[PDB]
Design a protein around this ligand. Sequence first.
Ligand SMILES: *CC(=O)NCC1CCN(C(=O)C2(Oc3ccccc3)CCCC2)CC1
Ligand SMILES: *CC(=O)NCC1CCN(C(=O)C2(Oc3ccccc3)CCCC2)CC1
Ligand SMILES: [Mg+2]
Ligand SMILES: [Mg+2]
Ligand SMILES: [Mg+2]
Ligand SMILES: [Mg+2]
Lengths: 5, 5, 229, 229
Amino acid sequence: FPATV
Amino acid sequence: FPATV
Amino acid sequence: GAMGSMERASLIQKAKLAEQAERYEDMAAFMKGAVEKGEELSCEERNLLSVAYKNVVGGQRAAWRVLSSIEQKSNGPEVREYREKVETELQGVCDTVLGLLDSHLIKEAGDAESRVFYLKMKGDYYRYLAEVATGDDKKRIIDSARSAYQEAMDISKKEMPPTNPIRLGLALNFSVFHYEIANSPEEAISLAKTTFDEAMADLHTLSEDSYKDSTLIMQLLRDNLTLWT
Amino acid sequence: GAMGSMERASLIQKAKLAEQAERYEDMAAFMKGAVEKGEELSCEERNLLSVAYKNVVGGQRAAWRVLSSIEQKSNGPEVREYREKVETELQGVCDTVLGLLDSHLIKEAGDAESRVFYLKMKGDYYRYLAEVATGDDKKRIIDSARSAYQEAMDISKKEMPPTNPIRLGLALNFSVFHYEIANSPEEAISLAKTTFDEAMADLHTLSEDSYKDSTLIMQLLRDNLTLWT
Ligand SMILES: *CC(=O)NCC1CCN(C(=O)C2(Oc3ccccc3)CCCC2)CC1
Ligand SMILES: *CC(=O)NCC1CCN(C(=O)C2(Oc3ccccc3)CCCC2)CC1
Ligand SMILES: [Mg+2]
Ligand SMILES: [Mg+2]
Ligand SMILES: [Mg+2]
Ligand SMILES: [Mg+2]
């Protein structure tokens, strides 16, 4: 589950 | 911090 | 109540779903709803009730300890105010649980397992109230916890084998009460050691699954004993 | 609002306390309160707003994915019902954030950093709405997210250096949008790669602290690129 900020 | 259940 | 319109079985199913989603506030609400249907709870249902409220109150206790620590080290009114709000919320949750036990779980609990479980719970939620109480209220809360735990112990020692996970769990928690709350570390150590030793000798009567349940809690007794001695 | 009676500085202080206690629902409420005082937010205050709602919505998205997975594998109405409740709660949180942006954060955001941050946020909360939407609503929500992200990108490319953490964060998230939401993996990869490469070349102008902020987000770009290629 890809990285977001 | 001691174990409780 | 807010869950009064939902089927009992559906409340239980949704509590299990909430557990899988780590939605412990939802899980508690569903289980409150289930209790309030007026029927006695099963072993699985008591587990679900306990897991739900233990996780909610766990989070509150963790938050309160963080805030109290910040309050201590800070000695404006924001830290004390926010700590008091969390405190009040925690108090409200404990009051709800004690209420459920009063209306009408304990009074209808006729079997050893149900009655001990609920009396253990009574002890636990007074213990949580004691962690945040002060003065004369604290002394009375502490003694209430002790009374509930002691009655649970008396029933458990008479009616349940020493490997019973409810008996084991009770002793674990009551031991923590003695050490952290009542400042009786010798009673804490004695209870934990004797519980462990009596259970050990009865392990040979258990199936593999029960062996796993019992030895898990025995490990927790050892873990605490390691901290204390 | 519910926080309308509390001093602005106290709301911010309590948001910081809530963060330390991992009480993200409280943190969001305090930051909503702070926004609703009507003053523009600082860089630190935008961080607090973002951390609070990202954690709340994060928990909801995690819960929704768990429930949807159980719903999928289960193909009574309890799973669908509970998934829909969580969905509605998530939708409500996104609507609240979009509301804050509308009343009146974006319209008063005149600087590149503030305007890009808020436009990025608009993109993120439409992206979360898109994850749970269907049909024509989903298409419109997706396009709204894309519009917000694109305007943010346009401002960021004109007005901010390629190492700016807000620019980097925006590109990271918009790249994830392309890949997971719009089914445009080549656009996702291109955006992430070009962002990383442009930032790399500007690192030499940064202090140690800014270097750490920028390279952290660049690592996340690499992490995603590793998953995608
Ligand atoms: C018949 C009945 O009421 N059973 C209750 C369950 C007994 C097993 N059990 C546990 O062992 C754990 O929690 C727990 C133990 C003792 C008291 C209260 C809770 C589950 C994970 C840690 C031990 C669940 C309750
Ligand atoms: C001036 C201003 O508005 N600053 C906002 C902060 C920029 C630094 N920052 C971050 O780098 C992290 O979050 C984040 C980055 C980009 C957009 C949104 C959030 C903090 C931890 C991960 C990166 C916080 C916001
Ligand atoms: Mg108080
Ligand atoms: Mg004794
Ligand atoms: Mg829906
Ligand atoms: Mg492009």
